[PDB]
């Protein structure tokens, strides 16, 4: 790493905090643009222990909903814990009641039904007129975006046939929400279903009640689904990537009744499988039977996806290797001293942004040849006798233990479409270190960074009279735990330069946050 952090400020990203009864006024450095009048809503953990019972993993902490509101002249900050079953039961009983991702709860009997986690710390997104905080299970939580108050719990299994769903659904311009999850295939097998929730209608009834299944992807292993964090979507195509990080459902049903495990205990890695890629015709609702294959890696975040003549351009934030990257994300290890953090990540998967290019229409004549005839890429697709199609990427970004993660674009105008710029959070040995801009064509980058300060995902907000793709700002929440300073602040950067425009400073700490959403109010 170019940059070191011997002071260990990043510890404060994983430290419990309390709620606010009502919003704080933020002190403002610089000038806020007058056009920017909305609400930045983000999610993340906020309570990392229940008394003397600690949560162990990064994705175990109880969900905390954050809001930076730019209404009138000032900026305000507010935060409330989401009154989930996981939270409400824990506060009631002064203990950990619901098993989280990596923290297993124990009884204080008569067992009767597994209590799948409710803890929606990962993300928030809009369905119709409403907003839903979520995790990666079937339970999503309706919230009030004005007040941050918890409205309702929704069980997705009541409407669609899926076991869970990602916290990275795609939202179309008309409001239609797409998402992917595990299901049971028609013949004693596992598969992946694409869920479609339509936009609100004149009759005004709940859009979720009109949820449906578009298509079903098959599973490489009959009784083991891969882990799915997100997927790709274009106007005509749906793209799903099957990684070697498999879920071993066997283990959780065994240990639940017998010993007592958690979610992380079910994960295993398929050594010989590599990475399978899948395409579906979105409109015809067909799975296109094209056996795209490539070498092993973990994938959490798609960056963007789009069509180019008879090809799909697929940009991904990868991690080279089949070992589960989440292994490296226990809070005990993230709260280590800097020297020990770097040591711990030495044998970790190596991050790399990759452009994969999938030919849509294959022909047997070109068996044994590179099919990617596009002029401006070095990505490769080889047609074999297997009838499998072996892929090689065009690398866009690669730094030793430096990850371009939590990717974001101008999603409203360019999501699913040809594009040039992507923005992301820099991870220095897993510690969020800096903010990054990237030209996906030229590979040129820009970096914002300051010492002893640890920012969140950079969300792009378009200029209402934008002429270019990068015409707008980037919001990021920044934690600066240095001595004689403001614990944290919201950062606002000009998306062109990546230069600083303003700051909304606060007198209290903010923990790590994962994903969010800007609401143009």
Only one residue has tokens 């849509």, namely: 360
Distance CA 101, CA 267 (A): 11
Based on C-alpha coordinates, what's the Rg of the chain? Answer: 22
In angstroms, give the least distance from the CB of 208 to a second copy: 41
Q: State the binding string over 392-431 for a second copy (x if CB under 8 A, else -).
A: x-xx--xxxx------------------------------
Output 21 or 376, the one with its CB closest to a second copy.
376
Output 333 or 380, the one with its CB closest to a second copy.
380
Output 109 or 272, the one with its CB closest to a second copy.
272
**Alpha helices, DSSP H, located in 386-454:** 411-414
Give the residue, chosen from 273, 382, 466, 517, that forms a contact with a second copy under the rule CB under 8 A.
382
Give the residue, chosen from 45, 46, 296, 407, that forms a contact with a second copy under the rule CB under 8 A.
296
Our finding on whether 517 is near a second copy (CB under 8 A) is: no
The string of DSSP letters for 371-406 reads: ----SS---EEEE-SSSEEEEE-EEEE-BTTEEEEE
| Triad 408, 23, 448: Cα angle to 5° | 30
Q: What is the DSSP letter of 154?
A: E
Give the residue, chosen from 178, 252, 256, 390, that forms a contact with a second copy under the rule CB under 8 A.
390
In angstroms, give the least distance from the CB of 12 to a second copy: 26
**Alpha helices, DSSP H, located in 72-159:** 85-93
Distance CA 137, CA 181 (A): 9
Give the residue, chosen from 52, 109, 272, 442, that forms a contact with a second copy under the rule CB under 8 A.
272
Our finding on whether 265 is near a second copy (CB under 8 A) is: no
Residue 168 annotated as lining a ligand binding site? yes
Output 25 or 378, the one with its CB closest to a second copy.
378
Which 12-51 positions form the footprint of a second copy (CB under 8 A)?
Answer: none
75: how many CB neighbours lie within 10 A of its CB? 25
Residue 515 annotated as lining a ligand binding site? yes
Phi, psi of 205 (to 5 degrees): -75, 160
Partners of residue 438 on adjacent β-strands:
422, 445
Our finding on whether 329 is near a second copy (CB under 8 A) is: no
Task: State which H helix or E strand residue 338 sits in.
Answer: helix 338-344
Our finding on whether 492 is near a second copy (CB under 8 A) is: no
Give the residue, chosen from 201, 257, 378, 521, that forms a contact with a second copy under the rule CB under 8 A.
378
Q: Is 193 exposed, middle or buried (0-12, 13-18, 19+ CB in 10 A)?
A: buried
In angstroms, give the least distance from the CB of 379 to a second copy: 8
Residue 229 annotated as lining a ligand binding site? yes
Distance CA 320, CA 60 (A): 25
Our finding on whether 445 is near a second copy (CB under 8 A) is: no
Phi, psi of 425 (to 5 degrees): -95, 125
Distance CA 227, CA 319 (A): 14
Interface with a second copy (CB under 8 A), residue total 42
Our finding on whether 322 is near a second copy (CB under 8 A) is: yes
Give the residue, chosen from 255, 370, 445, 509, that forms a contact with a second copy under the rule CB under 8 A.
370
The residues that touch a second copy, with contacts defined as CB under 8 A, are: 269, 271-272, 294-296, 320-323, 346-352, 366, 368-373, 375-380, 382, 384-386, 390, 392, 394-395, 398-401
């Amino acid at each position: 790493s170019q940059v070191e952090h011997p002071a260990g400020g990043y510890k404060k990203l994983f430290e419990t905090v309390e709620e606010l009864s009502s919003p704080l006024t933020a002190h403002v450095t610089g000038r806020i643009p007058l056009w920017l009048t909305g609400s930045l809503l983000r999610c993340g953990p906020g309570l990392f222990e229940v008394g003397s019972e600690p949560f162990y993993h990064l994705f175990d902490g109880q969900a905390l909903l954050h809001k930076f509101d730019f209404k009138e002249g000032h900026v305000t900050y507010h935060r409330r814990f989401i009154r989930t079953d996981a939270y409400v039961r824990a506060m009631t009983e002064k203990r950990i009641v619901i098993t989280e991702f990596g923290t297993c709860a124990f009884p204080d009997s008569y067992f009767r039904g597994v209590e799948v986690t409710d803890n929606a710390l990962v993300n928030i997104y809009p369905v119709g007129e409403d907003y839903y905080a979520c995790t990666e299970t079937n339970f999503i939580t309706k919230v009030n975006p004005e007040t941050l108050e918890t409205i309702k719990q929704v069980d997705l299994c009541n409407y669609v046939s899926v076991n869970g769903a990602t916290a990275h659904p795609h939202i179309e311009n008309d409001g239609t929400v797409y998402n992917i999850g595990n299901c049971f295939g028609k013949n004693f097998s596992i598969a992946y279903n694409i869920v479609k929730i339509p936009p609100l209608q004149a009759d005004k009834e709940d859009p979720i009640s009109k949820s449906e299944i578009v298509v079903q992807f098959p599973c490489s292993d009959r009784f083991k689904p891969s882990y799915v964090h997100s997927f790709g979507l274009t106007p005509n195509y749906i793209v799903f990537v099957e990684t070697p990080v498999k879920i071993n459902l066997f283990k959780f049903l065994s240990s639940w009744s017998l010993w007592g495990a958690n979610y992380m205990d079910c994960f295993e890695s398929n050594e010989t499988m590599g990475v399978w890629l899948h395409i579906a015709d979105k409109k015809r609702k067909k799975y296109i039977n094209n056996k795209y294959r490539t070498s092993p890696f973990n994938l959490f975040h798609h960056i963007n996806t789009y069509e180019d003549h008879e090809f799909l351009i697929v940009d991904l934030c990868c991690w080279k290797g089949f070992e589960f990257v989440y292994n490296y994300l226990y809070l005990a290890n993230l709260r280590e001293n800097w020297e020990e953090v770097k040591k711990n990540a030495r044998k970790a998967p190596q991050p790399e942004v990759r452009r994969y290019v999938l030919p849509l229409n294959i022909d047997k004549a070109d068996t044994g040849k590179n099919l990617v005839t596009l002029p401006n890429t070095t990505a490769t697709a080889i047609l074999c006798s297997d009838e499998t199609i072996w892929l090689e990427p065009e690398v866009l970004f690669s730094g030793p233990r430096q990850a371009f993660e939590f990717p974001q674009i101008n999603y409203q105008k360019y999501g699913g479409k040809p594009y040039t710029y992507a923005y992301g959070l820099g991870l220095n040995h897993f510690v969020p270190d800096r903010l990054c801009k990237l030209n996906v064509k030229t590979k040129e980058t820009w970096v914002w960074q300051e010492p002893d300060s640890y920012p969140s995902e950079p969300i792009f907000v378009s200029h209402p009279d934008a002429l270019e793709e990068d015409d707008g700002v980037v919001l990021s929440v920044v934690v600066s735990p240095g001595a004689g300073q403001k614990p944290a602040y919201l950062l606002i950067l000009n998306a062109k330069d990546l230069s600083e425009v303003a700051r909304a400073e606060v007198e209290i700490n903010i923990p790590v946050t994962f994903h969010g959403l800007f609401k143009k109010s």
